Write a protein that binds this ligand. Structure first.
Ligand SMILES: NS(=O)(=O)c1cc([C@]2(O)NC(=O)c3ccccc32)ccc1Cl
Lengths: 372, 892
């Protein structure tokens, strides 16, 4: 029976080659970074919930060790991990690679994982809960992994949960959320990926009863008019979202107590280089690329403050939401040191009861109201 | 603050303009910054009532409602006529649900049913349905106009103006009518809408006249003609069916009624001129269906409650005591009809008078006007729908000889050419006037279109594509499938031969469109379903465990761009096609000088070239600083679950001698990594080198040339396996597999039973097994000199040095070969020189040579020397030489 199954799979994979890619037929092609899947099952579950029977879902594990010492273990443990996934009833492909560092292995996976058109277009990673107590090199590597995912047009999906990452353990996602609401903070236009992921989640039996609330930014003067132009774009997409809220007060200065929290949270990583030219900043950067010069802090005052203010708005709306979705701010390479970038991600999702997902598309349309 | 939010950041905020494609107002296009920007550094529109409801209702209503409905009710009973109407409404309403669901998805543009079907199911069936629908509507224009002409000719002969004759006179009247309709249609969409509204008002006045007349106490003549007003006895008597005549069968009534009440796509077919199709099509069509159904039910109920089935009509039939005799209770109202119901003669009543509806009404002229309005409205709607559907078809340019008619003259498209063609077809088909032999074909065509609409809905729903997000949510995939199946079955039952003809035409059109391979890509449930099948079966294959009996050769071919080394890809495809996985790898070192979209376009182009090449292979390209790193990445990650490559096919670098030695060093490193990763290596050496479709030696047949296999090492059967599957193909059938097994003459049957006769068990059937015991005998000095001279340029003369001194020297020059190694492995060196001597004499006319690949010891054997054997192992060999070394796992 294996031969016929393999032949069917190969035949259909080959036949998928002539099929062209269409916006109406786009599918989230997920490459979750779980390592050993049993260590971080929650994450897997979530992706499965919206990939089940709908799109491909690969699991990426990077090994640290010579091939010879790993080849036997590689072959005899990949099957164990696959059988664990199957026993958990997930239609995901396990794939492990060996590299000196996690970033290199993730790069090779994103570059080569996939057969033809069934290659991931999204990288689903888990939040680094200990990014402060960890060696700054690790935080720099994680941020660089995000940058690499962007370089490949991979839509990033950073998942943060209060509990953390770590019979099979039961996670919150295997239960039913019920009537709780799904808050989607579509602050910036990522091409719709921030909206498709929660739409597919609600289409599942466990999220059908969730009342999806969409939050957008507007100005206090034209709240009413802007409430309708966005309640109309959602209608054109025919996503079934219930409400549309607007927050003119996102640009107001964060509270004087919370803002200092952000500054004290980035105190250790400050390089204190706010009076020297960029050509005079690199030498004290070679060993410490994560250090944040005072110069870079000045140009990111508004942006850093806005993230703090965003966390204020979310902390007063989604206190009791089943799931929180917030667009992922995009730092610029060469101007957003890993320390500053991680602070935003930490500052964005924090202090609440987060099933928060920080999604961010590749600035390419994934939802269309315009049949060809 | 009080700023328009996204005012202090280069990132944008969601806006409709970002997703709009059409010429969105504003003379511009606010487009979100590209990921490389944030990242990196440095015409009247009608409403639903006047565009869907009115038009669909006018198309539904026809002559049958006025002329055959009272007959059907009288013949079948009120209950049975209601049941027939309910079955017809069930089919039509399920089709309407399907069409509404298909309409809601996306923004429906001009084209009508054709546009929706093509954009939902696929271009292949879309074109066929478009052509069928266009022709059917064109012919229906003629049929409706002929019916109207027949009614007018009847009313004329009622007044004594035969002109020519009952026949070939309706020709003239209906041609005049069709010219009138064509002129009005060409006038303008507003004029057509006004004409439809006028016909609607006329039909409404006719209905009101009928209903008022039925409530007037009967007159003398009307009473004689069987009209008796509302009576409980008459209503109860007509409940049961009184079948009579050759059409007295229930299925006959059902077949007569069904075509009349199916014109439910009149509104959708002009969706181009709809203010908002997504909300006007569903509700309008459902309301039209409901109102027509209620009208039919009410007409049946009332007419069955006023007119008796049989009546004489002669005034002398008054009832006087003694005279005559009664059966039933009609005489209770002072009328005797026995003189007929015994003889079955007179012509009046609900079962023998088709014009009973006109007589029961308050004024016959109003009924005639209603008939005229119904026929004309149906004809005009058919003409408009056919013209617009054909215009969309031609705009879609699927078919070769319809492009001309697509272009639209004037403003607001206005498809004048299509209108003229439809009018010409209608007049040519009406000149015949012989439509009864052609009507069932058109009815079956429309049934085919209904089946395809319902199946498009069901297929889209079952596929469950992310793009399938339809606003209408009162449908059912199972209901749509039931409607489609019922459409096909009804089409077959009404007339099996006509159904066969329609299915044959549709199949011809579908096969023609699929043959013509229309390049247009609209997105469809077909493509999404193909992806779903691929994913489902790939995951299924993944869930299966691993063992030996399922082993397949899964080749990763280092061919860079496939169009630069066609011979390698052709070779791999020959023995991998339809058997296992084949992946064409490609490593770009470069700076890559491009955003990812450019690389994606190049990859799509290369995949298209592969597909045109007729090769089932996946083109995977990566980026890395050097070729070694790209190969390592591809070996490490390329694949999907179980269906990963386990064999590395790579070409031969013929110009290693004159190139920088680091190139040969990294080549040998690639081979060593492949061996380390448990990859069976396969070196494809061609005498001319590896570097619209380029011809290759592996394409042409080769007849009966000898396939020589020079086995000299038990690698697990990989060496024999490839030629095995390589000869089971058509192009390698007549060739003889002369495997020169490395062994001894005494062993001709041992490795025979070991492989050759075990390959009688392995079903290889190798004819000859010629032993070569002279491999170890000393080679010729000249050939030996050729080998030493080849290794001379890389000579390092490290032998006159200490072991540690040996190690230090190569901390920067590991390509160079020391003399100490030469003495260390002299026996192997001369072994390969002689082995090439054995092959050149023995295998000179062979079609393909397979030789076990020599394997040096990394570190213990230098890279340059190892490559030197490979060059010397297969030098000057005429046919394409293949070097193989298996995983060390028994393949068979
Ligand atoms: N205009 S239409 O395509 O929606 C349509 C028209 C009819 C039609 O007007 N109704 C008919 O009885 C008929 C006969 C011949 C041609 C056309 C017709 C029947 C079904 C449909 Cl789906």
């Amino acid at each position: 029976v294996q031969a016929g199954s393999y032949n069917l799979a190969l035949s259909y994979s080959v036949g998928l080659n002539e099929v062209e890619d269409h916006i109406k037929n786009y599918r989230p092609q997920c490459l979750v970074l779980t390592g050993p899947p049993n260590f971080r099952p929650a994450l897997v579950d979530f992706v499965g919930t919206f990939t089940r029977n709908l799109s491909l879902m690969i699991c990426g594990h990077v090994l640290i060790g010579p091939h010879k010492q790993r080849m036997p273990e590689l072959q005899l443990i990949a099957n164990g991990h696959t059988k664990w996934l199957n026993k958990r009833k997930i239609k995901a492909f396990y794939s492990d690679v060996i590299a000196e560092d996690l970033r290199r292995g993730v790069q090779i996976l994103m570059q080569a994982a996939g057969l033809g058109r069934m290659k991931p277009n999204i990288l689903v990673v888990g939040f680094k809960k200990n990014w402060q107590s960890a060696h700054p090199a690790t935080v720099e590597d994680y941020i660089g992994i995000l940058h690499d995912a962007f370089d490949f047009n991979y839509g990033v999906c950073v998942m943060r949960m209060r509990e953390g990452l770590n019979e099979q353990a039961t996670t919150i996602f295997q239960s039913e959320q019920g009537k709780k609401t799904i808050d989607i903070y579509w602050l910036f236009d990522d091409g719709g990926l921030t909206l498709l992921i929660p739409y597919l989640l609600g289409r599942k039996r466990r999220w059908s009863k969730c009342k999806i609330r969409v939050f957008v930014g507007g100005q206090i003067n034209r709240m009413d008019q802007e409430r309708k132009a966005i309640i109309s774009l959602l209608s054109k997409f025919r996503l079934g979202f219930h409400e549309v809220h607007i927050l003119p007060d996102i640009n107001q200065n964060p509270r004087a107590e919370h803002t200092k929290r952000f500054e004290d949270m980035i105190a250790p990583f400050r390089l204190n280089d706010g009076f020297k030219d960029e050509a005079t900043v690199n030498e004290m950067r070679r060993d410490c690329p994560w250090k944040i010069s005072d110069e870079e802090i000045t140009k990111n005052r508004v942006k850093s403050l806005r993230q703090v203010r965003l966390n204020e708005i979310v902390l007063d709306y989604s206190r009791d939401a089943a799931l929180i979705v917030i667009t992922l701010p995009i730092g610029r390479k060469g101007k957003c040191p890993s320390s500053l970038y991680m602070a935003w991600l930490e500052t964005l999702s924090q202090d609440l009861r987060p099933p928060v997902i920080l999604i961010r598309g590749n600035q390419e349309n994934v939802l269309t109201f315009y049949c060809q």
